[PDB]
Design a protein around this ligand. Structure first.
Ligand SMILES: C[C@@H]1O[C@@H](O[C@H]2[C@H](O[C@H]3[C@H](O)[C@@H](O)[C@H](O)O[C@@H]3CO)O[C@H](CO)[C@H](O)[C@@H]2O)[C@@H](O)[C@H](O)[C@@H]1O
Ligand SMILES: [Ca+2]
Length: 122
């Protein structure tokens, strides 16, 4: 699968659901990061575009209380790269996952209605 970053204009950020719909409209989905190689591919996409210091929706979304986080594309949640302290379900309203697009490439749970950049896979 090919990844593509979407860091558009200031008023062009999207909720998690809007981002998922955008990627699905192109025949793909929000990006799942299944291992370190895929993480590196995305990090180099960030360096290549110069789209530094941005946050991006990934395909992380909460399932049932039993299962916790899942990937929107159905991939297993094998690899995890949560930032320290995450996921923390801050104020009980955080059911989607974002990537901090810095060298650590760490993940944070955040409210799904937050407006973010996003990363698709096709
Ligand atoms: C939502 C939060 O995101 C990260 O923490 C950031 C922090 O979130 C604030 C948020 O701006 C505010 O609306 C809420 O009421 O309190 C949160 C906790 O301080 O904001 C600071 C900037 O002030 C940084 O951007 C933090 O990264 C994440 O670390 C948390 O787990 C949580 O998902
Ligand atoms: Ca959080």
């Amino acid at each position: 699968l090919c990844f593509k970053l979407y860091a558009k204009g200031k008023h062009e950020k999207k909720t998690w659901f809007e981002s998922r719909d955008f990627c699905r409209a192109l025949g793909g989905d929000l990006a799942s990061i299944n291992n370190k190689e895929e993480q590196q591919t995305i990090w180099r996409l960030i360096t290549a575009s110069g789209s530094y210091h941005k946050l991006f929706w990934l395909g992380l979304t909460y399932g049932s209380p039993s299962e916790g986080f899942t990937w929107s594309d159905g991939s297993p949640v094998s690899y995890e790269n949560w930032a320290y302290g995450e996921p923390n379900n801050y104020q009980n309203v955080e059911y989607c996952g974002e990537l901090k697009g810095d060298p650590t490439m760490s993940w944070n749970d955040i409210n799904c209605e937050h407006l973010n950049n996003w990363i698709c896979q096709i």
